[PDB]
Amino acid sequence: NLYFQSMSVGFIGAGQLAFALAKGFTAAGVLAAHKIMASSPDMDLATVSALRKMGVKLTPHNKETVQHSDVLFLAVKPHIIPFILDEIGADIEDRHIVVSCAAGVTISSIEKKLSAFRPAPRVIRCMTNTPVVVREGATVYATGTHAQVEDGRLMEQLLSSVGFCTEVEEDLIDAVTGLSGSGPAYAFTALDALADGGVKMGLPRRLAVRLGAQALLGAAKMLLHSEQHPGQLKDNVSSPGGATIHALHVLESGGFRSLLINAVEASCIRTRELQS
Amino acid sequence: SMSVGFIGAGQLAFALAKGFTAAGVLAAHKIMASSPDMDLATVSALRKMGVKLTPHNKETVQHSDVLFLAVKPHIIPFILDEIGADIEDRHIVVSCAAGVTISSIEKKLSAFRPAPRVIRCMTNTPVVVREGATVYATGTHAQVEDGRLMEQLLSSVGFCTEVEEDLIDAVTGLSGSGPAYAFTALDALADGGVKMGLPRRLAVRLGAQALLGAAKMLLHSEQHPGQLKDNVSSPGGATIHALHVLESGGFRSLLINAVEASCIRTRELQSMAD
Amino acid sequence: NLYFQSMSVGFIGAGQLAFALAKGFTAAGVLAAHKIMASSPDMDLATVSALRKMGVKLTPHNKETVQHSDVLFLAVKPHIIPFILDEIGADIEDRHIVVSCAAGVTISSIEKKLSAFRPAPRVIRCMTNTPVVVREGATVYATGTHAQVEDGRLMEQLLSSVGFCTEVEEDLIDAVTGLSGSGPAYAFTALDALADGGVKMGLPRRLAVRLGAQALLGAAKMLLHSEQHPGQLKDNVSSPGGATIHALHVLESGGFRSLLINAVEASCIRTRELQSMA
Amino acid sequence: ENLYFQSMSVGFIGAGQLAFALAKGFTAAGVLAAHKIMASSPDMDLATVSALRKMGVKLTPHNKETVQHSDVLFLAVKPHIIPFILDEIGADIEDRHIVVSCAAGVTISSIEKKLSAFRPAPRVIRCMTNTPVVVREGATVYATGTHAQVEDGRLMEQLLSSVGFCTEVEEDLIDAVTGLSGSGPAYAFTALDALADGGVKMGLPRRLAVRLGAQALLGAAKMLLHSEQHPGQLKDNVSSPGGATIHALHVLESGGFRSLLINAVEASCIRTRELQSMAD
Ligand SMILES: O=C(O)[C@H]1C[C@@H]1c1ccccn1
């Protein structure tokens, strides 16, 4: 409570992630909308329109966002980050916690750019995902060289208000991107395809969408609340000779498992490329 | 207020009882379940919950008003023969067995007493965490209050809606078998996380939380799942690269294949029952 | 009601793209054909005979095109561009706007070449496609170092008369090449195959070509005029259990989607190699 | 224009996607007043029904009211509902009606068999159209039934041409048309979503990639319709030696791109034939 009581948050970038976080934070009750500020070069964006309706102060100047924020989220594409650290770098102060959300961008790279201005910049690296908008995000963070003990603690409480959150070593964050960072996109693909199959077999599309989504939600919650291995839960619900085991067979015949492994791998490797 | 019985005491009976009593809609002590093999792990878990257990299907009928049939589909004919003479005006018979049509249940129960009140439903195991997906069709002699009662009960443990009976085999392929597709996906995503360096326990948690939040996002937006995929794929980024490798494998067609195969197998099991 | 009275346009090159643009510009009414000049080392091309019928002035000499023109389109193969710039570089004046349509050729390389002759050449890079010929092209452009503000607005005005036109950062043009630059060829291949499919199921070839093209035209127009996701429009057409969803499944089973992603990717990456061969 | 002053009353049995697309197209074309259209559905909770309401279309749950209102009556329900529909309103079909069946696969013979038990000479037309009529760029074929007057086919062609291409065919081509242009817009929506994904993968904003892909497909289709040339010739004309386009065409060929579209037309046509055989 005392963490967020006298806390101001700014977003460099008013894109998809910034709206999701701002929307998650306000819905959780941790931050008030008017106490949040975002800067965007293009105010013609859709997210920039939705954020204004929320009551989020918007500005074109990143230097304005830096001046009126304590915790500063960097929610821009990785290639813009060094151009932004050169723009607002002289405005970073001792009180700023800089939370980097750009994929791939290492703590070392941010600290190197900001250490040329003030010596001990407090930096945290973050991999979250869009379901923070419904407070069911998956977030990890690593603390940088000069982050104080309370800084990790403040970050953990804030990000926990909108989903799962835990600290990791920074070298795991590329892998987390490929799993839970890109994860929701795999799920949306899967739901579109599952609804298509429902439609093929005679269901109205709207019902097929709803039923597929409820199935995934329930199965994930079930796994999260179980002590049990995913395979054991698969085994429990697969009756001998039944419909479900017949469907699992056709998933196995297309190498379904290898495609998800391929996906996690390809997103992680792309994240490593964007750093280098 | 109401008395509920379970013929069968396996995965589905435990999942519904646990969900119902966790929802606060049923008291565990007003639930009775019957099983032949009184040594299944599910039979022990139902005891630890407060549920009254028995080996006589006839005692479960005499105890309950709402009667769930949660046995394998090939046992349903034999159960309707054993207790058919014990069904009264008061009973609502709710069949959860996959494929088993309302017609076949009504024909068997009508030889003992006309106008049996029958409901067919397709549900799934996540009712155990109150996040099931349930559809139901009302039989010939189900009164209106029967279907409204069933929707109130089953809504307390997940999504529930009424459908025409000829959709239920498709629903089986989609949300009936759906959780198993998700467990397969979660096992594979976790293997991917581990290959890229994550501890298994962390990778299982992150993969499960991702699927949960994605599903909730879609349930709470007006938006097409393709649109949400568009919203989360930045140009040139890690996600769109991973989506490409899913597409190159025909990821979408495999899930369509799955729904189709489960629905078709469901229809075969009803046919061999005819 | 657009018309550029004080503007004279020249094309260096007289192949597919120069004809398509000149045909589009003259059909749109924005340019009289006699105010357009084109040059080609092969004055016996099929497109060259077509341009002469429209009334377009033709000449073998690239210096003549430059000396007659204000807006100068470079509509030649990418590896021809450096030799062109060597040839006409000393003829470029302050009045010239050089619009390069060559795939992959960067603004930087054109400006470096032309700056040897006269400082501050006004350069615009353009990625367009052949449907400008029926005034339904897809065009993006990026403005160069010394291109004035009035230069980009002028090119957007002209290119908008023959289809969609918008300004982009130069580093998106390779990717636009992969999508809308090469896109019409993907569509032609698709329409050939769809027609084959109609013929297999018993349609006359002429009807099947007509119906397939009309289907693609109407679907693209639906998407352009709708605020909706293409997945949602797909959803509205597929009746439960119906013929369409059965066909979508066999598309999905062959990985239809990934092949189009593969295509955009391959065209873009090849475009980058040609920009590095420069 | 000449059709508008005919002051035709039009009915749709079914108020789904195709009924909305056609009603929207006819009203945009100015050939029909929205309030001169009546549509019926057993489910008034459909989004298409609410859109129809907003347009000014008359809505009723009673198919008989739609029939009594109509001069030209469109059957736009799923193919397996048609026989139940003809049983219900067959007695209300009058000599003045033109019955236009849009149901995929449903033959003129089966409709005439049902309706002829009531009046002797039902005027029946079978048509295959598609959802781009909503932007007046539909693809429509129709076949005239046993008792359709020569004027009935001409009126149909006039009406359907106001919302896109329209031509008369023998009925035995209509299953194949269904697999090509009936299902075709969905093949294109899939292609456009994928092409956009490819644009985004190579660095384009989604909004721009969607716009460019759609514009490309529209321009290419128009090019072909206005050309007297083979699609392969247009492909040849635009693929420069060693260029980016010919490289991309190779990777399409290596995945069997052409065969997937042939497979699709075939599968939709074959499914359409099964929807009729399951009826009969
Ligand atoms: O829904 C489908 O699968 C399409 C085959 C049917 C259709 C009917 C009428 C007009 C256009 N398409």
Side-chain angles (χ1 to χ4, degrees), chain A residues 243, chain B residues 73 76 95-105 120-122 165 168-169 172 262-263 265-269 271 273:
Chain B
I76 286 257
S95 180
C96 303
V100 179
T101 65
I102 298 179
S103 158
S104 73
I105 300 153
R120 171 184 185 182
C121 94
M122 171 45 50
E165 197 192 355
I168 290 184
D169 296 350
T172 304
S262 171
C263 172
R265 180 61 179 175
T266 297
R267 301 173 175 160
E268 298 178 343
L269 301 181
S271 289

Side-chain angles (χ1 to χ4, degrees), chain B residues 2-10 12-34 36 41-42 45-47 49-51 53-57 60-71 73-106 109-142 146-147 149-221 223-269 271 273:
Chain B
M2 111 188 324
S3 189
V4 171
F6 286 106
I7 307 290
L12 197 53
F14 169 77
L16 284 164
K18 169 53 59 193
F20 287 152
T21 52
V25 292
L26 301 177
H29 77 265
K30 292 212 72 74
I31 305 182
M32 186 162 161
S34 53
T42 50
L46 285 171
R47 172 168 290 97
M49 197 194 317
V51 184
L53 289 106
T54 183
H56 308 134
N57 292 316
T60 324
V61 173
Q62 308 184 29
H63 144 100
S64 50
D65 313 313
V66 183
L67 195 73
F68 286 90
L69 306 180
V71 301
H74 68 273
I75 318 286
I76 286 257
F78 300 99
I79 268 146
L80 296 173
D81 264 311
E82 186 202 338
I83 54 89
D86 300 329
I87 296 291
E88 307 198 59
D89 313 321
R90 74 157 178 286
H91 280 114
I92 301 171
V93 180
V94 180
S95 180
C96 303
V100 179
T101 65
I102 298 179
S103 158
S104 73
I105 300 153
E106 291 182 352
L109 288 175
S110 286
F112 303 91
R113 143 198 299 284
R117 291 152 77 196
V118 181
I119 306 280
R120 171 184 185 182
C121 94
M122 171 45 50
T123 186
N124 58 9
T125 48
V127 295
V128 75
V129 288
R130 303 188 63 201
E131 286 295 346
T134 301
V135 304
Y136 70 95
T138 50
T140 309
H141 315 103
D146 297 338
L149 180 168
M150 291 325 299
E151 184 150 357
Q152 286 176 14
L153 189 58
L154 281 154
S155 277
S156 63
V157 297
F159 173 76
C160 177
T161 193
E162 182 178 357
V163 296
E164 294 305 281
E165 197 192 355
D166 55 29
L167 305 180
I168 290 184
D169 296 350
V171 172
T172 304
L174 174 58
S175 58
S177 299
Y181 314 152
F183 302 137
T184 303
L186 284 168
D187 191 23
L189 286 168
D191 288 328
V194 171
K195 187 192 185 186
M196 304 317 293
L198 300 175
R200 163 75 52 172
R201 193 169 150 273
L202 179 56
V204 173
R205 178 73 164 98
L206 289 173
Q209 182 69 43
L211 293 213
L212 187 119
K216 191 185 181 180
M217 251 184 103
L218 182 61
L219 284 172
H220 285 65
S221 71
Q223 307 242 86
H224 197 277
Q227 183 60 63
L228 295 184
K229 181 208 88 219
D230 288 1
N231 295 348
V232 309
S233 307
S234 75
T239 301
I240 189 73
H241 279 69
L243 291 173
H244 194 181
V245 312
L246 291 178
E247 300 281 10
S248 299
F251 184 70
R252 292 165 181 273
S253 68
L254 303 187
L255 291 158
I256 296 170
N257 291 345
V259 173
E260 176 177 59
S262 171
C263 172
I264 286 181
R265 180 61 179 175
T266 297
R267 301 173 175 160
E268 298 178 343
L269 301 181
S271 289

Side-chain angles (χ1 to χ4, degrees), chain B residues 224-227 229-230 241 243-244 247-250 252-253 256-257 260, chain C residues 228-232 235 246 248-249 252-253 255 257-258 261-262 265:
Chain B
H224 197 277
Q227 183 60 63
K229 181 208 88 219
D230 288 1
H241 279 69
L243 291 173
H244 194 181
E247 300 281 10
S248 299
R252 292 165 181 273
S253 68
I256 296 170
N257 291 345
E260 176 177 59
Chain C
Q228 294 166 83
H229 195 268
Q232 177 64 61
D235 283 4
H246 275 74
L248 290 173
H249 187 188
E252 295 293 351
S253 293
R257 293 168 178 267
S258 65
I261 303 172
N262 289 345
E265 180 173 51

Side-chain angles (χ1 to χ4, degrees), chain D residues 3-4 6-44 46-53 55-77 79-83 85-112 114-150 152-153 155-206 208-227 229-275 277-279:
Chain D
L3 243 152
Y4 165 80
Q6 297 308 285
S7 216
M8 285 193 332
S9 310
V10 174
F12 291 92
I13 286 164
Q17 302 283 337
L18 192 88
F20 168 79
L22 279 172
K24 189 74 178 309
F26 289 147
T27 55
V31 311
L32 288 181
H35 52 259
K36 289 286 293 186
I37 301 170
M38 186 177 293
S40 50
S41 178
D43 184 22
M44 304 274 84
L46 303 157
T48 55
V49 170
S50 285
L52 279 171
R53 248 179 208 301
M55 283 175 53
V57 173
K58 313 294 195 182
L59 288 151
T60 170
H62 303 307
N63 291 327
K64 170 181 196 161
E65 287 187 34
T66 304
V67 173
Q68 286 181 339
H69 162 87
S70 305
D71 307 328
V72 167
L73 175 69
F74 288 94
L75 312 182
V77 292
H80 66 283
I81 312 288
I82 293 278
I85 287 327
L86 301 170
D87 284 337
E88 174 198 2
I89 53 84
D92 308 306
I93 302 297
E94 306 168 68
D95 295 354
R96 67 192 181 73
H97 279 115
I98 302 171
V99 178
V100 187
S101 176
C102 295
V106 171
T107 66
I108 288 168
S109 152
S110 69
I111 298 156
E112 285 176 355
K114 288 255 176 212
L115 296 181
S116 282
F118 299 98
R119 293 297 287 150
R123 294 148 71 187
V124 171
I125 297 186
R126 180 176 169 190
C127 111
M128 173 45 58
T129 191
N130 58 7
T131 59
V133 295
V134 74
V135 287
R136 304 180 64 194
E137 284 298 347
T140 302
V141 308
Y142 67 93
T144 57
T146 318
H147 315 279
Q149 298 295 279
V150 66
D152 299 334
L155 169 61
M156 173 79 35
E157 183 156 347
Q158 296 176 28
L159 180 60
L160 281 163
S161 289
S162 69
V163 300
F165 173 83
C166 179
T167 196
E168 187 184 359
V169 297
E170 313 278 356
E171 190 189 5
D172 59 20
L173 303 188
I174 291 177
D175 295 351
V177 171
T178 309
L180 180 52
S181 55
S183 300
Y187 313 152
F189 295 140
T190 301
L192 287 168
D193 191 27
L195 282 168
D197 278 347
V200 173
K201 188 195 189 183
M202 305 314 298
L204 298 178
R206 171 71 54 169
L208 179 69
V210 173
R211 185 65 152 98
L212 288 173
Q215 187 63 48
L217 260 57
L218 194 149
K222 191 182 179 188
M223 235 183 121
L224 196 157
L225 295 175
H226 286 56
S227 187
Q229 300 222 282
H230 193 268
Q233 186 59 61
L234 299 182
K235 179 267 276 155
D236 285 9
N237 294 343
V238 304
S239 319
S240 49
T245 295
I246 191 68
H247 278 66
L249 293 176
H250 190 184
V251 301
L252 296 175
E253 298 286 4
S254 295
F257 182 71
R258 292 163 179 274
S259 67
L260 305 181
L261 294 162
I262 302 167
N263 290 346
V265 177
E266 170 175 63
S268 168
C269 177
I270 288 170
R271 182 58 179 174
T272 295
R273 295 173 180 157
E274 292 174 357
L275 292 170
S277 306
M278 267 163 212

